[PDB]
Amino acid sequence: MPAYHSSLMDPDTKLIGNMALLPIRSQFKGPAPRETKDTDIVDEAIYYFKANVFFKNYEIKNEADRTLIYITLYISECLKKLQKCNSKSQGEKEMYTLGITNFPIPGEPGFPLNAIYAKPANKQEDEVMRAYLQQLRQETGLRLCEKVFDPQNDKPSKWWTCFVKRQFMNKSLS
Amino acid sequence: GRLPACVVDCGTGYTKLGYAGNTEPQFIIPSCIAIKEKGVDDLDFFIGDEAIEKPTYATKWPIRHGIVEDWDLMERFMEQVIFKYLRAEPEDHYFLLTEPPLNTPENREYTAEIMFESFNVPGLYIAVQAVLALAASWTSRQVGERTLTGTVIDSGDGVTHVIPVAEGYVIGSCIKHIPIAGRDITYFIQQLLRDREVGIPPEQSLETAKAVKERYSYVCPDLVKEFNKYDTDGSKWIKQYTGINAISKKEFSIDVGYERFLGPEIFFHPEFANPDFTQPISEVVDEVIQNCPIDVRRPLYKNIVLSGGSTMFRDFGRRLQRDLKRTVDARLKLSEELSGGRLKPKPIDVQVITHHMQRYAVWFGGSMLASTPEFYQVCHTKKDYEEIGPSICRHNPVFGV
Amino acid sequence: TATLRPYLSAVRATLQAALCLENFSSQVVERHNKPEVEVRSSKELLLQPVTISRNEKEKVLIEGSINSVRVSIAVKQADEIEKILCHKFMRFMMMRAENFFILRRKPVEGYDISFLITNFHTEQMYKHKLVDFVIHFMEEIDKEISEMKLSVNARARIVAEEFLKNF
Amino acid sequence: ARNTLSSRFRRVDIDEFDENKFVDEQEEAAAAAAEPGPDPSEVDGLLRQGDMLRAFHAALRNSPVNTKNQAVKERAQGVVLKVLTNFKSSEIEQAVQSLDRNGVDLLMKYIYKGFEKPTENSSAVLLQWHEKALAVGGLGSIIRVLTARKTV
Amino acid sequence: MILLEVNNRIIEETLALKFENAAAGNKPEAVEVTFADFDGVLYHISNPNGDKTKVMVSISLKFYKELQAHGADELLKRVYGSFLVNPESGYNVSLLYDLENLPASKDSIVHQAGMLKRNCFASVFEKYFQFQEEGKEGENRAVIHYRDDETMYVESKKDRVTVVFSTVFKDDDDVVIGKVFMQEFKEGRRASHTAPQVLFSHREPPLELKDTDAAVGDNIGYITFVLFPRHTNASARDNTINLIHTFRDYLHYHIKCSKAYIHTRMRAKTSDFLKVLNRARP
Amino acid sequence: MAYHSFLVEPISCHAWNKDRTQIAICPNNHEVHIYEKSGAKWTKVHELKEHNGQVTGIDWAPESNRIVTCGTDRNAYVWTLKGRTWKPTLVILRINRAARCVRWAPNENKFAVGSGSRVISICYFEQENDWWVCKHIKKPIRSTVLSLDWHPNNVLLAAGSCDFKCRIFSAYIKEVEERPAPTPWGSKMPFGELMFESSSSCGWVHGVCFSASGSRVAWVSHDSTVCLADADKKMAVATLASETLPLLALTFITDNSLVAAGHDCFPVLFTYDAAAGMLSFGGRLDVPKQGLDSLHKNSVSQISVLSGGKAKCSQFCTTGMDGGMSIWDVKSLESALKDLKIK
Amino acid sequence: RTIGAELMELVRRNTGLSHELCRVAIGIIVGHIQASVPASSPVMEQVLLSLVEALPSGQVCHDQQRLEVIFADLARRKDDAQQRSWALYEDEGVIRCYLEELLHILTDADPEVCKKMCKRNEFESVLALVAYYQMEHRASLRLLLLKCFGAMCSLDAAIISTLVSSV
Numbered sequence A: 001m002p003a004y005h006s007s008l009m010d011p012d013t014k015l016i017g018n019m020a021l022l023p024i025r026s027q028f029k030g031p032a033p034r035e036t037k038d039t040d041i042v043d044e045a046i047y048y049f050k051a052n053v054f055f056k057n058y059e060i061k062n063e064a065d066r067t068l069i070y071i072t073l074y075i076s077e078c079l080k081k082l083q084k085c086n087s088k089s090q091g092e093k094e095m096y097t098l099g100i101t102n103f104p105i106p107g108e109p110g111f112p113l114n115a116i117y118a119k120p121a122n123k124q125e126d127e128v129m130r131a132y133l134q135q136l137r138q139e140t141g142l143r144l145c146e147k148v149f150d151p152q153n154d155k156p157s158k159w160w161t162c163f164v165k166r167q168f169m170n171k172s173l174s
Numbered sequence B: 001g002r003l004p005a006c007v008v009d010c011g012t013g014y015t016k017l018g019y020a021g022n023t024e025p026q027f028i029i030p031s032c033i034a035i036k037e038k039g040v041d042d043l044d045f046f047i048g049d050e051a052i053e054k055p056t057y058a059t060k061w062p063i064r065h066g067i068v069e070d071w072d073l074m075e076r077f078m079e080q081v082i083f084k085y086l087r088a089e090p091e092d093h094y095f096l097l098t099e100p101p102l103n104t105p106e107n108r109e110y111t112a113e114i115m116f117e118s119f120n121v122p123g124l125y126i127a128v129q130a131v132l133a134l135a136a137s138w139t140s141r142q143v144g145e146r147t148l149t150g151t152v153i154d155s156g157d158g159v160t161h162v163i164p165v166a167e168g169y170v171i172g173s174c175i176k177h178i179p180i181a182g183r184d185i186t187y188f189i190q191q192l193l194r195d196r197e198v199g200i201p202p203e204q205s206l207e208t209a210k211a212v213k214e215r216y217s218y219v220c221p222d223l224v225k226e227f228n229k230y231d232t233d234g235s236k237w238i239k240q241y242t243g244i245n246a247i248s249k250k251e252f253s254i255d256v257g258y259e260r261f262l263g264p265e266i267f268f269h270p271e272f273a274n275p276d277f278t279q280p281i282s283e284v285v286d287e288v289i290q291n292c293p294i295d296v297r298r299p300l301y302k303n304i305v306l307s308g309g310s311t312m313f314r315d316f317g318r319r320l321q322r323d324l325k326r327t328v329d330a331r332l333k334l335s336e337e338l339s340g341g342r343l344k345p346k347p348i349d350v351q352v353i354t355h356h357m358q359r360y361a362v363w364f365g366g367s368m369l370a371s372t373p374e375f376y377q378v379c380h381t382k383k384d385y386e387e388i389g390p391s392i393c394r395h396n397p398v399f400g401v
Numbered sequence C: 001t002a003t004l005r006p007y008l009s010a011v012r013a014t015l016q017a018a019l020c021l022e023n024f025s026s027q028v029v030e031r032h033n034k035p036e037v038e039v040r041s042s043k044e045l046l047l048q049p050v051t052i053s054r055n056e057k058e059k060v061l062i063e064g065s066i067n068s069v070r071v072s073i074a075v076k077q078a079d080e081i082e083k084i085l086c087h088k089f090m091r092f093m094m095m096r097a098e099n100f101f102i103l104r105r106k107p108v109e110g111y112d113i114s115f116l117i118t119n120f121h122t123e124q125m126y127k128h129k130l131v132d133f134v135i136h137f138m139e140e141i142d143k144e145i146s147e148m149k150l151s152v153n154a155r156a157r158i159v160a161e162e163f164l165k166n167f
Numbered sequence D: 001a002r003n004t005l006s007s008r009f010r011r012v013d014i015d016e017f018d019e020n021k022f023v024d025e026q027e028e029a030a031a032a033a034a035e036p037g038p039d040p041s042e043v044d045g046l047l048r049q050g051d052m053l054r055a056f057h058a059a060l061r062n063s064p065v066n067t068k069n070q071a072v073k074e075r076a077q078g079v080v081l082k083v084l085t086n087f088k089s090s091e092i093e094q095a096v097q098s099l100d101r102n103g104v105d106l107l108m109k110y111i112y113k114g115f116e117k118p119t120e121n122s123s124a125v126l127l128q129w130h131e132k133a134l135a136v137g138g139l140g141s142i143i144r145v146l147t148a149r150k151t152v
Numbered sequence E: 001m002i003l004l005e006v007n008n009r010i011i012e013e014t015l016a017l018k019f020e021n022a023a024a025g026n027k028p029e030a031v032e033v034t035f036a037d038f039d040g041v042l043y044h045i046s047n048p049n050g051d052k053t054k055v056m057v058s059i060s061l062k063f064y065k066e067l068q069a070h071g072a073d074e075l076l077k078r079v080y081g082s083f084l085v086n087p088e089s090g091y092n093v094s095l096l097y098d099l100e101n102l103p104a105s106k107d108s109i110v111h112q113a114g115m116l117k118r119n120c121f122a123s124v125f126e127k128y129f130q131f132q133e134e135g136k137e138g139e140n141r142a143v144i145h146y147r148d149d150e151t152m153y154v155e156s157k158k159d160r161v162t163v164v165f166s167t168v169f170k171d172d173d174d175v176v177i178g179k180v181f182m183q184e185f186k187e188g189r190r191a192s193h194t195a196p197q198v199l200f201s202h203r204e205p206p207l208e209l210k211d212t213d214a215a216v217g218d219n220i221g222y223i224t225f226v227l228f229p230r231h232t233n234a235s236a237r238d239n240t241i242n243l244i245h246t247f248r249d250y251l252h253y254h255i256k257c258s259k260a261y262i263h264t265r266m267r268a269k270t271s272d273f274l275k276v277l278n279r280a281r282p
Numbered sequence F: 001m002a003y004h005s006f007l008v009e010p011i012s013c014h015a016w017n018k019d020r021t022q023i024a025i026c027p028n029n030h031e032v033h034i035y036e037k038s039g040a041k042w043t044k045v046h047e048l049k050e051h052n053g054q055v056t057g058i059d060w061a062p063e064s065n066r067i068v069t070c071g072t073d074r075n076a077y078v079w080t081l082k083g084r085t086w087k088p089t090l091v092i093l094r095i096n097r098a099a100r101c102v103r104w105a106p107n108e109n110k111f112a113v114g115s116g117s118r119v120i121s122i123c124y125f126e127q128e129n130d131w132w133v134c135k136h137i138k139k140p141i142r143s144t145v146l147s148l149d150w151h152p153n154n155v156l157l158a159a160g161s162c163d164f165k166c167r168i169f170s171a172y173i174k175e176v177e178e179r180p181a182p183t184p185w186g187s188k189m190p191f192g193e194l195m196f197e198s199s200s201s202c203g204w205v206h207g208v209c210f211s212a213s214g215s216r217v218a219w220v221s222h223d224s225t226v227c228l229a230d231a232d233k234k235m236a237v238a239t240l241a242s243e244t245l246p247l248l249a250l251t252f253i254t255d256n257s258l259v260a261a262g263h264d265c266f267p268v269l270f271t272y273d274a275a276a277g278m279l280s281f282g283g284r285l286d287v288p289k290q291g292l293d294s295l296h297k298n299s300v301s302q303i304s305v306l307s308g309g310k311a312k313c314s315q316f317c318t319t320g321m322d323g324g325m326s327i328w329d330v331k332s333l334e335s336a337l338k339d340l341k342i343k
Numbered sequence G: 001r002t003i004g005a006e007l008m009e010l011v012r013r014n015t016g017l018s019h020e021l022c023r024v025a026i027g028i029i030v031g032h033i034q035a036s037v038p039a040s041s042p043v044m045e046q047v048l049l050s051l052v053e054a055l056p057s058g059q060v061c062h063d064q065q066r067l068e069v070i071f072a073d074l075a076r077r078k079d080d081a082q083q084r085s086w087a088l089y090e091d092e093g094v095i096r097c098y099l100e101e102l103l104h105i106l107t108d109a110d111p112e113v114c115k116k117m118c119k120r121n122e123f124e125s126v127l128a129l130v131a132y133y134q135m136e137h138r139a140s141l142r143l144l145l146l147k148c149f150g151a152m153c154s155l156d157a158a159i160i161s162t163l164v165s166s167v
């Protein structure tokens, strides 16, 4: 059967490059509009993370799938740093520092999906992309730390750090 | 007096022996052979349960995907099956063997080349495994109400097959053959635990994965909803398995989590293990039946017989019977729309039954058969071998000419 | 019962004479490319058969053609226990004929083994090494049988001791 | 699967009754009267006195290649094959070196015919003959045995 | 496994399952099992009259009339005793083990249940082994048809017991290898000096049996066993009988298993040649 | 004495352009790869992909620059270089079996294809439909045709077959040329007339080449018997039976001497004396290299004349099953072998 | 222009020397022909400078080829689920041969080759051995892997972060 795709795409949803500039519920600042609903492109990708890393074939139906694939690849970067953390406060400090890092973007080397992603043509669209992703890289990390850490010991769970070796298909943002 | 026939279902995991006429086999042993690590030294070997425990011997598994790979060992595996366990003088007893559908002809030829020349048997019949499993179900069924028409799903350790049967005749050109089975489920649990639960010795990872599979595992209605149930309410769904080390004799314990439903899921998401296969078994069955003649599509949906040890999973038919009825009630809906909506066609009565005998279903259909007189007609014979040669056993129903 | 050096010297020369091959498309079927020595539809493309022999039993038969050669061989079998071990040995050599690319899955009638060498083997494989395999076969086969006859006799003693010792 | 229609038409072979089959040519002049071949009394009278080297050339002078008859060929083979078997092993190089090219090729034809049906010691001799004729005539002598459409 | 086992697995396996269940207090489970052994033997384990507490090990030897003679009816009684009861229908002997009236130390009655075929053959040997010890000569030989196309002649003398097998080799590849195996039994007294003497007449029988309607053929084989009193005495007649009633099957076991040794060795030499050809592959 | 291994597999056929600047090999496949001579290197420039089967014969017309191919798919294609790419042009051979050889004519107005259909197809152009229609010559022939060569009159044709013969035919096409001048081979040369049929009937004729004078033709056989017929001497044949493996292709370097090559994996030379009326072995040409002892490590299937024509050749090319192409320099062999003489 | 690097590859192939002693042997030979034969000093000094101070375009080192062949089989033998948990074929002698060869390369060859082929594709080849170690139970092979890990830690410190963060 197929993997889990994004249901949130709507024709009224803006496009950046060939991705889906979708609303995000965050206190962080960026080009992403603020959402009112109780579900977002982030809460989905965290719902569907543990299941989508076992599949080996993903068919890109729309552009919101290109936004989900990015997060699902970045969550595997959070867990590499979080498994080394001994307290949630130490994780939130590590999740900040990682989002500030300038990962590759569509068009340049490092990005594993340069072919099936559309780079920004103009410089203004480039500046919007680098600030949309950084808004995802920050709210993703902030929301994992609520889940990874067992409140009984305030230390990472083996049920999340078992997916450290499970890349999305085999790709990584590095 | 007149002697019954020997029956042997050499499978990937377990091997089923005995004589005809009986209801359950006289032996059920793993398909292993223990050898040392010229002269009479090729006879220092053990098979079955006498092979696992042997410390100074190397355990070998000569069968993969139902087919044999090293006939140097299987010729030694069969000369203890006969002379040690069964204690049969093969020049007197006929024989019934089993093959999967996709067994090559050259393996059927080397089989008969072994039994007829080396062991000098007077007869031999190489039957299809899952077909015998359907005859067994008919005895559980009422007498006279026997349904000759039925679909069969036989999944063991090596490979999984879907075989339709209509009015007694096998529709061989519509068979499917899914390479996913209990060995792929086991190596997938053996993988998830190496990532999470270190503390399992490498010598006891396999023993630990079968134990989890046979006991704790099950089948889920939806995958991602189970991950939440294991996360949100972990005390209820996470079990614990205490083992015993074999060196220090100290216990080791682990937490049994996502591998309870992820192993069996590869029946429905087989790209978890094998990237060369994506289609679920719920869809393979629909193509098997929709490729069959239009008149025997309904009776085949109504008798889907699960056989094999890797269909013992809890709630396996409940999901297969549900993934089909979704697929079948839609197709009838679409046709009702294209026609004009003037006729509401009759619904199809899907039924997936899971019969009481599974560990020896195929053997049982071979014992009922061998106890007949009709068996002694279709059996290839020593005389027919000397004349025609080992190509007498070259053909199977899966192909023509 | 002549000698072994000249026998292999004759066979080696006849083989170099008969491995003068080239591709050749068929003239009875549209675009087939078969070895004409096997199908034998075109008599003109079939060279003569020539035989070599140390004696009545041992001999070689080179059936050549424009695009194929067939080298049947008869091995000496003094006693019955050698007829058996040679018959099995070829069966286990024919079963792996997809790995011996120059081999027939059955032998010519009257002979114990038969090779078949097409014009695609000489283009790919080294023509002079294929000959050295046929020759190496013909002088080692006698050694590899007596080594089995001696291995059967050694086994029969242990099977006797392991029974009589218990008395 | 299996078929249930008459498939017997695929058994009969029509290629037997074909008009494009190859036809090799024969000598018309020899069908009426065959070449007499080496007469036995000629060679034999030269064998009684031990003149092997001349009984040798007498057998290779006449050869019924153009003859369609097989007995005179067989009689001819038994004559020359009787001669080669009686030679002295040291005298063979003396005899082979005398022959012209076209006699060495005809010799090697008769040699590869002696290997077909051997006596007790007919082949240990012919392998020595084969060594000498090859030293003179080379592989090209054998090729004119393979390509030869007319047997000896 | 070089030597064949004399005690059947299915009986020792089946009874010990019942005997370990009942003595654990669990309830009895039914059973109906038909199976076989060598020499045309046919067993039958059953719950008689449906009584799941009783199990009845029967057996159907042909040639048992030859064994009721020589006093095997008494030999078997001296072993099992109470367990021996009236024969089941179509069968020659029938034991009966009561699951509620079991003794402790069950491994002895189990191990004796597997040896039922042995205890039947063990009469004709103990009778003739005693004749040598008593010095009785002039008694008649014992013709036993342990198979339809085979026969076992026994005979006793002052200093030796002579045991003959009129075996048969179906294929001609077996009679060729068989001469090799028997040609080394004859020389078996070179290593094991105390061992019995063995002989082998290919087609024709010996002189002791030419009058006795023996069979001749290009595939038959006559095999003799000369047993001296260091075998037939009371301390060794058990282990001697445990080997002699398995000889015909020991010989054929190793003819069929020698082929696998040959096959096992040609798959290797074939791979040695295949290294020489791959020299031609660039 | 060069050796450039284009590949490891055979080279069924080859052809050179006028300048000898480009070469068109078939690397044992359905494609024709055109390589250009850039200095001391070889660079591939084009690849012709139209055949449904293996190629067996190629010829390059020097003036028109029109390549013609024949393959096992019962097809031929006439290629014209339009701009930067080669475009084919269809051919109608009308043969039920596969083709084996092709040769352009001297005047480039026709070509002849030899096939396993027991025929030879004389092809010419038809602008009415852009086709190349063909006429057949299949009167005496009884089996496959292996080689061909054109007389300098642009009419007469020689053909070596597996019928053990080297016939000579008149490929006169009235629509494209006037009647020819007479020749010592005969005056009566209508379409499809057997002028000369050889006498030998042992061995398959692999190669055939006409002499520059047009009065001498030689042919090689699998019987290890080179031959040569002279029309001035009433079509008498002179053989020279060799003592080695056969030859597979020949060509006249002069009016008297030839060069052959084949399964012996090197070239040789053959000298003709019409005074005596025989051939003589001119010795091996390539020196034994300082198992095989030459450049070609397998057989040779095609020999061609680059420089000097058949009148007096200075360089000839060999193309073999060892994926190789060796250029030879004739005078360098004269110098490197003081015993060697080219008559 | 590139002699000093094309000679070291020739010498390590036909001698088996380490990287260090490959440069010593050339510096000694050259430095001695320069001194004994002053007529050749200009050529020799260029050759020495090529050593003190890259390879041709398509030319690839021998040690780099082997590490493509070794890391590829050991990862193929890791992904062979049947043979690991359900053994049929013999593997101890082949694996012991590839791990010995690996240990002589990491220990002797140029570290920058053995660094990049281990740092390639985010340490894909290192992390496999780390899993094959977890999967293997035979101490004859667990011991050679340890000697190989101990040689990979000496090359770079990014590999140490990869192993310690692993299982």
Ligand SMILES: Nc1ncnc2c1ncn2[C@@H]1O[C@H](COP(=O)(O)OP(=O)(O)O)[C@@H](O)[C@H]1O
Pocket (backbone or CB within 6 Å): B011, B012, B013, B014, B015, B155, B156, B157, B158, B182, B183, B210, B213, B214, B215, B308, B309, B310, B311, B312, B313, B358, B359
């Ligand atoms: N309760 C169970 N649940 C799931 N699998 C089981 C159960 N019991 C046995 N099995 C599996 O059945 C498999 C063997 O199936 P079977 O068909 O009997 O043998 P084979 O596969 O060799 O033909 C084993 O791999 C075993 O793990």
Ligand SMILES: [Mg+2]
Pocket (backbone or CB within 6 Å): B011, B012, B129, B156, B308, B362
């Ligand atoms: Mg099974």
